[PDB]
Design a protein around this nucleic acid. Structure first.
Ligand SMILES: [Mg+2]
Ligand SMILES: [Zn+2]
Ligand SMILES: [Zn+2]
Ligand SMILES: [Zn+2]
Lengths: 171, 262, 84, 93, 521, 58, 168, 88, 35
DNA sequence: TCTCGTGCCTGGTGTCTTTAATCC
DNA sequence: GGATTACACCCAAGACACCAGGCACGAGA
RNA sequence: GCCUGGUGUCUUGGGU
């Protein structure tokens, strides 16, 4: 679920970096450290808005160490999924214990006891799929699932889905 | 029944003293009007005295050096009497903890008890040295390890039966010591098995030197530090340790002071 | 919010002895960690000496944030404060 | 460095010098605190790089402090007498 | 820098929030439950789990890592345990406040005896300071001698109608005398901690605030102790009297006594309790927990060690000249200091101090290596720790020190920018000089070092007056600043010439003296 | 004075210490708001831009 | 590490279980409150973004930055190489391709039409745009919060969404 | 073991008279066994760090309890210098 | 503040109405019954 | 060879009664 | 009728649980 | 082949 968030990062700068392009170095430094990373508090930080024009403020000099501390306030595109949110997906793997679906950055696992009985795993078919008569779940098939639980590793978050409900499945 | 506070450890003495006073005054014009007195181990520092009047309690204790002079006696309720006189395990195959000797603190199985009923034969993991330093205490004992009869055979033994050896006048059967302990020498209650029990059941330093060149020529010293090229000689003559180059030293050897050919 | 605009600054325009000592020490420290020096260095190579030379030519690139009792503050650059 | 020498450095206004004397030149110590409950209850394994205040179930809002060892000692003696000294790093009014 | 890198953000302390530790919280931060007073496993090495030296509490030994944080003994702060008490006991520090709370509330339901309907009382709740408000309330409610079931129709205030007792303190026990409904017979029974504990949990949140307590930080039932926090071994280290014999800290022995006494309270309620015995054993648990925190309780004998001297309780650890606050925090012993007898020298400048060579080789300053001094600093490294001018350590950016006493390949060191060399003290370095007693600010002035033979400190004679120094045996102290920032602070604020005129009497404190003054006439 | 009594009383009434005094910061080992510590020092990003371009951070 | 405008969150006496993220119960946690504040203290509505808005902003930001990296000099696989590092290359490429296969209105002409049509809690308004629906019956089942609001237009919402929707 | 030199001790564990000693040198070697090879712990006595001089005399005897007992007297000469104190 | 404290205390350390240290003590101690 | 007495070590647990001023 | 207050720093020499009960070893009959 | 721990609590006598 996408949001725009106004964030900030404390950056410590060694004194040997105190030159006329200090701000431009910091702008590159902010992007390298923040883009693509995930936190349980906000989700995946996809891209930062207006990176080349961010106002970094003034740097506080740390007493006793000489290094400088900047509070870089910024605005980013963030992606965090939520429990209860119904979403579409693209299946990445199919296995006897369910399937794995890539929803953008991460992967969601749906287990077998939350999958309807009429969807039967068919390995003999070429290519392998969950099949019916007018339904077809191959890789890249639009499927509609609902996120029923979010677990947080603070590095990557893990969400478990379900297709054991009305109107969810292939379309 | 009144309770009375007495000096710790002197409860039996006070009970004794009360009996002597009672018996000595029987039939006189001033009998001690108490019926009984007693002291329970579980109730440290107290004696209980049976009578009809409080004054008799004061009479029983008068002059007793083991009793606290403060007027501290207390009344017991009739409904509390019998509990004051409540008198209160061990089965073959069960575990106990030894309370005495080199095996103090060790877990042991109860193998059997004496006919009379006093000492119990215990099965114990031994703490032996195989006579290694002979010509024991609980603080200078050995680690626990099952008896090994071939080790005893090699190093220092009487066979008595299948898997039974008498070694240094103790009996070991299938690796375990079987030894009699007084029942009062084992703990049978509230034993907590331990983790371990659950698992089981430069060549010129410091040599004397003479200096042959420079302002300190002819003086004795000792090489205190020889890091490289520059030595540290602790001169004898003034209380100072000097930095000195290696070309300047003579070292003592078997025959005199020798230059850098040592 | 807390910051006071340049035209409305009211604190003293002279560098105090305490501000001077902190500026010299901080700038000295940065030079010994190999910060770019803004003046020519001739014969005087001690860290404190170089920092004192920069001060005398009004070339120290630092700003004093003077806190007032209520928590508001006036930022003054060391380039604009008068040094006796 | 007694109480009377402390006062002399205040009079000189040499605040920077006084800080260094009583920390870097003596018994400086690093502690971790929980950003929520403010206690020194953080369990910090630095080679595994994982931190957790079990009471707050908090693995993200955690700060490090530099304080005198004798101050760390003081707070643990206060905790042992049921006094909670909560160290917060921000004001609120 | 002496601290290994940690990704957690570094911040300073802005606020200290005091309060009480709830029973629930004590268990939440505890890492082990403490039950057995036997310190050792069975005197066969490795201390007993669940015992007072359980290794989960921490390491005070150089070779055992902490089983909770994995860090060495230097970094490991220690982790608390907890000790469950069989029966709740009073906190000795809070008894007189507990006593005050009893006269304020109803001893059945716990409601504040007065309402905003009382005009003077409505003024008293407005008082902003919690302590003064609480006192103002109690000053009113003290004379209210019955908890009214009815407001002062029948309007009920939640009261129970009971008359309230006059509570009196008798040592560690509180006695309440109730006036049963002219004069009749009153029966004062003992107000046990457990009885008072239940009453306190029923106090409403709204009355908790009005009593000056605080719902989040100082909830009033937390003044009664039900679970005791067990401090880690860093608070109570062992000492070795004669190398292979170690005695325990006073707290370690005292915690053993509380722990033994705790087991015997469990040993009573399941069998032979002659009631009059329960009161002697429970009071003794109260006693040990009291003298564990404060062993200067007025009106009763002190707890004694077997040596006969009084036990060092936690309260006594903090007070007085040698305790934690006046002895280790407001002042403390410091590194990079020196002391010797002083002598005068007229042929030194006013702001110089002559420093003996031996002292100058022991003290050091960590100078950062830069492009402008790298050649100069390498010369010091070759000379080593024993030839002056020399150097003692080379410190890398990671923090590893190279000890130049034992480095036999000293010639193979190449210095990198950003490293540090701890060089010897050298000419014109500023140092802080000081003579006790420091009666005024010119007892501490910065002088410039001049290294000299012989073992006294040399002063130019005209500075003897501000120090009130002379040379009849006086000693003085020297302190070496350890960084670039403090060198500049010394020379630009504390230096001798800046101190010639004193603010005390707007006049100089140094002049020409003794021989030079006699001679100049 | 009255060292331990102050601290017991401070606990029971949940006192907040705003750390503005000299003594508070000295015993916690932090730079005290006095003399050289009575202000903060910031880096003048505007004045650095008058330096030549070969001094620039990459 | 990285923090936001929202601070403190000091302890309160009464706990709360309106924090657990549940899109059905409009619980977005403490960071995604309805009223946020920007880096100047100004009040601001929560910014939830549909798939169509998000595709335009992210793609624009990447090519404007790419042009800036080139001193001022379409396909998703080309736009993702602007990032630095294989970790960054992965997340950005997967997000565009995911949006490439589920964004109905893939251009700014149609998107601004959808923008004006939609521009009452701000979260629900964003949900309706992301989840395609045919009829009113399909919207209130999968999104059970639209039940008791009594303000449809829903049908004309879905009709315009489906009519603007290009064939495939 | 202590960091100082042990090379001035004779085989009886005692240093002999006439040997100059400096600070931290061991002059009386003594060990204590470690309870339950490589079983002992050093309990030796070093010369005070600030001193030097010559060992003058070594007393060897036994005490009231029958164990061995030693005393080592060290002599040095102090020569007046800058800083020393005098009085009429 | 500290300068004031030292400026008053230092002269006192070297020093029919009451004068000197006993009188100084009455002031700081703001005694209700002076001598 | 057996029994009794003495000495040493380890474990557990206290008690005959016998410096002066000030303030709150 | 109760405690708390009573300069600062520094040096150095001079000291350390008791009693009772149980078990083991040695000597004498 | 780098790391490297020696006590405390008092009392008494002294120095400025
Ligand atoms: Mg003198
Ligand atoms: Zn916490
Ligand atoms: Zn630890
Ligand atoms: Zn009531």
């Amino acid at each position: 679920m996408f949001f725009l968030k106004d964030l900030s990062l404390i950056l410590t700068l060694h004194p040997s970096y105190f030159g006329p392009q200090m701000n431009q170095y910091l702008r590159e430094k902010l992007l390298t450290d923040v883009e693509g990373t995930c936190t349980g508090q906000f989700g995946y930080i996809v891209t930062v808005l207006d990176g080349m024009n961010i106002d970094v403020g003034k740097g506080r000099i740390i007493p006793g160490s000489g290094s400088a501390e900047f509070e870089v306030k910024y605005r980013a595109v963030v992606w965090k999924p939520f429990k209860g949110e119904v979403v579409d997906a693209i299946v990445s793997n199919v296995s006897p214990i369910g399937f794995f679906a890539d929803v953008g950055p991460l992967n969601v696992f749906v287990s077998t006891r939350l999958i309807p009985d009429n969807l039967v795993y068919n390995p003999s078919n070429s290519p392998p799929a969950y099949m019916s008569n007018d339904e077809l779940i191959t890789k890249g098939s639009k499927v509609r699932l609902k996120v029923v639980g979010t677990r947080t590793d603070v590095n990557e978050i893990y969400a478990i889905g379900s297709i054991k409900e009305d109107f969810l499945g292939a379309i | 029944i009144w309770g009375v506070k007495v000096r710790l450890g002197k409860e039996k003495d006070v009970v004794r003293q009360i009996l002597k006073k009672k018996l000595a005054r029987e039939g006189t014009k001033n009998p001690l009007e108490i019926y009984s007195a007693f002291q329970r181990d579980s109730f440290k520092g107290h004696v209980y005295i049976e009578a009809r009047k409080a004054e008799a309690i004061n009479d029983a204790l008068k002059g007793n050096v083991n009793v606290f002079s403060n007027n501290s006696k207390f009344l017991v309720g009739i409904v509390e009497y019998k509990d004051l006189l409540r008198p209160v395990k061990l089965t073959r195959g069960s575990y106990v903890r030894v309370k005495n000797g080199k095996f103090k603190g060790d877990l042991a199985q109860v193998d059997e008890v004496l006919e009379n009923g006093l000492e119990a034969r215990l099965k114990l993991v031994p703490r032996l040295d195989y006579g290694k330093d002979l010509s024991y205490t609980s603080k200078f004992r050995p680690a626990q390890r099952l008896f090994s009869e071939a080790e005893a055979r090699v190093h220092e033994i009487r066979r008595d039966r299948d898997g039974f050896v008498t070694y240094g006048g103790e009996e070991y059967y299938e690796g375990f010591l079987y030894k009699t302990f007084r029942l009062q020498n084992l703990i049978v209650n509230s034993i907590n098995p331990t983790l371990n029990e659950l698992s089981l059941f430069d060549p010129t330093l410091n040599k004397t030197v003479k200096i042959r060149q420079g302002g300190y020529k002819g003086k004795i010293g000792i090489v205190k530090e020889a890091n490289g090229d520059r030595f540290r000689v602790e001169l004898h003559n003034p209380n100072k340790t000097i930095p000195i180059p290696c070309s300047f030293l003579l070292i003592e050897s078997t025959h005199g002071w020798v230059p850098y050919e040592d | 919010e807390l910051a006071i605009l340049k035209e409305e600054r009211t604190t003293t325009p002279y560098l105090t002895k305490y501000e001077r000592a902190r500026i010299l020490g901080t700038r000295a420290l940065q030079i010994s960690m190999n910060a770019p020096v803004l003046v020519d260095i001739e014969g005087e190579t001690d860290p404190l000496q170089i920092a004192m030379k920069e001060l005398s030519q009004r070339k120290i690139p630092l700003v004093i944030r003077r806190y007032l009792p209520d928590g508001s503050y006036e930022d003054w650059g060391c380039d604009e404060l008068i040094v006796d | 460095f007694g109480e009377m020498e402390r006062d002399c450095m205040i009079a000189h206004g040499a605040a920077g010098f006084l800080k260094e004397r009583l920390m870097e030149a003596s018994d400086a110590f690093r502690v971790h605190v929980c950003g929520i409950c403010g206690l020194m209850s953080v369990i910090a394994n630095l080679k595994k790089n994982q931190f957790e205040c079990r009471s707050c179930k908090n693995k993200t809002n955690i700060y490090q402090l530099h304080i005198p060892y004798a101050a760390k000692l003081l707070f643990q003696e206060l905790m042992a007498m049921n006094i909670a000294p909560r160290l917060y790093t921000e004001r609120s009014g | 820098s002496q601290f290994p890198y940690s990704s957690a953000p570094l911040r300073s302390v802005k606020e200290v929030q005091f309060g009480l530790l709830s029973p629930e919280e004590i268990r939440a931060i505890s890492v082990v439950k403490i039950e057995y007073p036997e310190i050792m496993d069975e005197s066969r090495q490795r201390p007993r789990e669940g015992g007072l030296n359980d290794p989960k509490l921490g390491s005070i030994d150089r070779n055992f890592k902490c089983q909770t944080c994995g860090e060495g003994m230097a970094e490991c702060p220690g982790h608390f345990g907890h000790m469950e008490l069989a029966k709740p006991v009073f906190h000795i520090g809070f008894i007189p406040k507990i006593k005050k709370v009893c006269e304020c509330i109803c001893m059945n339901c716990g409601k504040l005896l007065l309402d905003e309907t009382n005009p003077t009382m409505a003024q008293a709740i407005r008082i902003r300071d919690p302590k003064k408000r609480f006192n103002a309330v109690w000053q009113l409610c003290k004379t209210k001698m019955v908890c009214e079931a009815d407001a002062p129709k029948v309007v009920s205030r939640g009261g129970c109608g009971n008359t309230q007792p006059v509570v009196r303190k008798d040592g560690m026990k509180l006695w309440g005398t109730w006036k049963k409904s002219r004069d009749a017979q009153p029966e004062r029974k003992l107000l046990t901690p457990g009885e008072i504990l239940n009453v306190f949990k029923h106090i409403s949140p709204e009355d908790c605030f009005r009593l000056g307590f605080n719902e989040d930080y100082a909830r009033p039932e937390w003044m009664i102790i039900t679970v005791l926090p067990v401090p880690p071994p860093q608070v109570r280290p062992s000492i070795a009297m004669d190398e292979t014999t170690q005695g325990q800290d006073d707290l370690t022995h005292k915690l053993s006594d509380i722990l033994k006494a705790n087991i015997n309270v469990q040993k009573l309620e399941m069998d032979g309790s002659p009631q009059h015995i329960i009161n002697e054993v429970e009071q003794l648990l109260q006693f040990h927990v009291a003298t564990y925190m404060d062993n200067d309780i007025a009106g009763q004998p002190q707890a004694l060690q077997k040596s006969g001297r009084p036990v060092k309780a936690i309260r006594a650890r903090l007070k007085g000249k040698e305790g934690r606050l006046r002895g280790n925090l407001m002042g403390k012993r410091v590194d990079f200091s020196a002391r010797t007898v002083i002598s005068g020298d007229p042929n030194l400048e006013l702001d110089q101090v002559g420093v003996p060579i031996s002292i100058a080789k022991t003290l050091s300053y960590p100078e950062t290596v830069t492009q402008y001094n790298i050649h100069r600093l390498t010369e010091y490294v070759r000379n080593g720790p024993n030839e002056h001018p020399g150097a003692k350590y080379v410190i890398r950016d990671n923090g590893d020190r190279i000890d130049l006493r034992y480095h036999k390949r000293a010639g193979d060191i190449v210095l990198q920018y950003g490293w540090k060399v701890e060089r010897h003290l050298m000419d014109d370095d500023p140092v802080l000089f000081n003579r006790q007693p420091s009666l005024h600010k010119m007892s501490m002035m910065a002088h410039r070092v001049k290294v000299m033979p012989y073992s006294t400190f040399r002063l130019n004679l005209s500075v003897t007056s501000p120090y009130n120094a002379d040379f009849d045996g006086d000693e003085m102290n020297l302190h070496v600043p350890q960084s670039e920032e403090t060198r500049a602070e010394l020379s630009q604020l504390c230096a001798v010439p800046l101190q010639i005129v004193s603010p005390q009497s707007n006049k100089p404190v140094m002049g020409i003296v003794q021989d030079t003054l006699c001679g100049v006439r | 004075e009255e060292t331990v009594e102050i601290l017991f009383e401070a606990g029971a009434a949940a006192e907040l210490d705003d750390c503005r005094g000299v003594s508070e910061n000295v015993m916690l080992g932090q730079l005290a708001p006095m003399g050289t510590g009575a202000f903060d020092v910031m880096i003048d990003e505007k004045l650095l831009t008058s330096l030549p371009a070969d001094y620039a951070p990459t | 590490v990285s923090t936001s405008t929202v601070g403190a969150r000091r302890r309160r006496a009464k706990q709360q279980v309106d924090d657990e993220e549940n899109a059905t119960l409009l619980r977005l946690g403490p960071e995604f409150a309805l009223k946020q504040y920007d880096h100047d203290g100004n009040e601001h509505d929560l910014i939830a973004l549909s798939l169509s808005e998000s595709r335009l902003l992210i793609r624009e930001a990447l090519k404007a930055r790419s042009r800036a990296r080139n001193g001022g000099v379409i396909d998703d696989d080309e736009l993702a190489k602007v990032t630095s590092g294989a970790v960054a290359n992965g997340v950005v490429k997967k997000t565009l391709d995911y949006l490439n296969t589920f964004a109905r209105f893939k251009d700014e002409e149609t998107c601004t039409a959808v923008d004006q049509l939609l521009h009452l809690h701000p979260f629900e308004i964003a949900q309706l745009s992301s989840l395609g629906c045919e009829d009113v019956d399909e919207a209130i089942t999968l999104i059970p919060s639209l039940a008791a609001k009594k303000e449809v237009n829903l049908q004309r919402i879905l009709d315009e969404l489906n009519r603007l929707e290009d064939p495939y | 073991l202590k960091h100082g030199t042990y090379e001035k001790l004779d085989e009886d564990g005692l240093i002999a008279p006439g040997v100059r000693v400096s600070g931290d040198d061991i002059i009386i070697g003594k060990t204590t066994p470690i309870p339950p090879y490589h079983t002992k712990r050093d309990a030796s006595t070093p010369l005070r760090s600030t001193e030097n001089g010559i060992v003058d005399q070594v007393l060897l005897t036994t005490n009231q309890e029958g164990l061995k007992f030693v005393k080592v007297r060290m002599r040095t000469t102090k020569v007046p210098q800058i800083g020393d104190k005098f009085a009429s | 503040g500290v300068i004031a404290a030292q400026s008053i205390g230092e002269p006192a350390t070297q020093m029919n109405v009451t004068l000197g240290v006993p009188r100084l003590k009455e002031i700081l101690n703001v005694a209700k019954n002076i001598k």
